[PDB]
Design a binder for this molecule. Structure first.
Ligand SMILES: [Mg+2]
Ligand SMILES: [Zn+2]
Ligand SMILES: [Zn+2]
Ligand SMILES: [Zn+2]
Ligand SMILES: [Zn+2]
Lengths: 131, 286
């Protein structure tokens, strides 16, 4: 009974971060000792004629990005643990996340490390042009 | 292939929208085409669902510099026989709103202690994961009858984990700088540890130079067995699975080959007592 959600390749990293006192640090440390990034994400087939923006309600990748379902990007969502917010809610679940194609091999690690410009909606360092 | 870890135990037939699915596998079939997913304007998100996520299938084989390993060799368990605590958990089956996973009901230790928990599981919502009570029933086992009155008799997990840290600290403060849980068929005991174990790099107690064995969520601090009052998490425990030493039968039949003074009273602590006792006989005789 029930419907499987995960694949054997993610068991190690999902189990490690599911027990960690500090999941974000655990995943970065896990990546730093050569673990492979979390796979089985929700990759979108889209036109790549979108605004290029970071977090959106419909897929918005341009020609240098991939679009992903946002929850599949949320570490907290992938491990089913508490979210670091005071109110405990996720900013990515229910949205689409645009990831640079060069970083598309690790969507979960990208969003852990990066931040979105609240003025232009672009990733800082990967699209934000703000002075 | 697939794994059973984080299996979706809800009884909803569809689900879910690409923006809400944690994985590609759990995306609803309508959105799937050629190994990818498409967004479909007009098919809206689900903003009311509650989806029990299974915690059966944990694999502790990480190899990360500076993070101790929970599962230890027989030889290192022998060096730390003073830290040995038998541990067994009887569970209940999720029911009604969800089916396909088990939840910790009675936790037994070789100290003789049994703690009964409210059936609590991990439920995905459109927002987060809600650690909350769920519908559950005792196993159809005829021998699982003793579990029936336990269903209305468990404590909330925030109390249960307090009493665990509290019992391990009083038992082990003058014996060891760690705990080694001694198990038989570790699967569901490791699942139960999700409810009260945290792991990370080695730390030191805030009130001493001793190794940290406990952790407090309320204060974000670490403690040894001596200075753990109020702490709710066992930190960096160790453990070993006796069953994996090449035994053939069940727990009792193997325990009974060396010991005749631990009759089976079928409680979680009785299994835990028999597991530690078997480990002692197997490891220190020939
Ligand atoms: Mg067992
Ligand atoms: Zn999330
Ligand atoms: Zn900007
Ligand atoms: Zn101390
Ligand atoms: Zn015995």
């Amino acid at each position: 009974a029930g419907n499987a959600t995960e694949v054997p390749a993610n068991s190690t990293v999902l189990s490690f971060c599911a027990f960690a006192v500090d999941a974000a640090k655990a995943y970065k440390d896990y990546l730093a000792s050569g673990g492979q990034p979390i796979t089985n994400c929700v990759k979108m087939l889209c036109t790549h004629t979108g605004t290029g923006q970071a977090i959106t309600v419909t897929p918005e990748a341009n020609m240098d990005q991939e679009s992903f379902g946002g929850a599949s990007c949320c570490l907290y969502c992938r491990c089913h643990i508490d979210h670091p917010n005071p109110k405990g809610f996720c900013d990515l679940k229910g949205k689409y996340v645009q990831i640079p194609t060069t970083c598309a091999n690790d969507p979960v690690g990208f969003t852990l490390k990066n931040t979105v410009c609240t003025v232009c909606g672009m990733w800082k360092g990967y699209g934000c042009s703000c002075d | 292939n697939v794994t059973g870890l984080f299996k979706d135990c809800s009884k909803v037939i569809t689900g879910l929208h690409p923006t809400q699915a944690p994985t590609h596998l759990s995306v609803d079939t309508k959105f799937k085409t050629e190994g990818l997913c498409v967004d479909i304007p007009g098919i809206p998100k689900d903003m009311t669902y509650r989806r029990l996520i299974s915690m059966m299938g944990f694999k502790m084989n990480y190899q990360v510099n500076g993070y101790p390993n929970m599962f230890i060799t027989r030889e290192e368990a022998i060096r730390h026989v003073r830290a040995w605590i038998g541990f067994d958990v009887e569970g209940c089956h999720a029911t009604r709103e969800a089916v396909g996973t088990n939840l910790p009901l009675q936790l037994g230790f070789s100290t003789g202690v049994n703690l009964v928990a409210v059936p609590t599981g991990y439920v995905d919502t459109p927002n987060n994961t809600d650690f909350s009570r769920v519908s559950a029933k005792p196993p159809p086992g005829d021998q699982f009858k003793h579990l029936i009155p336990l269903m209305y008799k468990g404590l909330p997990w925030n109390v249960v984990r307090i009493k665990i840290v509290q019992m391990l600290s009083d038992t082990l403060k003058n014996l060891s700088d760690r705990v080694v849980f001694v198990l038989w068929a570790h699967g569901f005991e490791l699942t139960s540890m999700k409810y009260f174990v945290k792991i990370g790099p080695e730390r030191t107690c805030c009130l001493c130079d001793r190794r940290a064995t406990c952790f407090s969520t309320a204060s974000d601090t670490y403690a040894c067995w001596h200075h753990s009052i109020g702490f709710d998490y066992v930190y960096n425990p160790f453990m070993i699975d006796v069953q994996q030493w090449g035994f053939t039968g069940n727990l009792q039949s193997n325990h009974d080959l060396y010991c005749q003074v631990h009759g089976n009273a079928h409680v979680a602590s009785c299994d835990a007592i028999m597991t530690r006792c078997l480990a002692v006989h197997e490891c220190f005789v020939k």
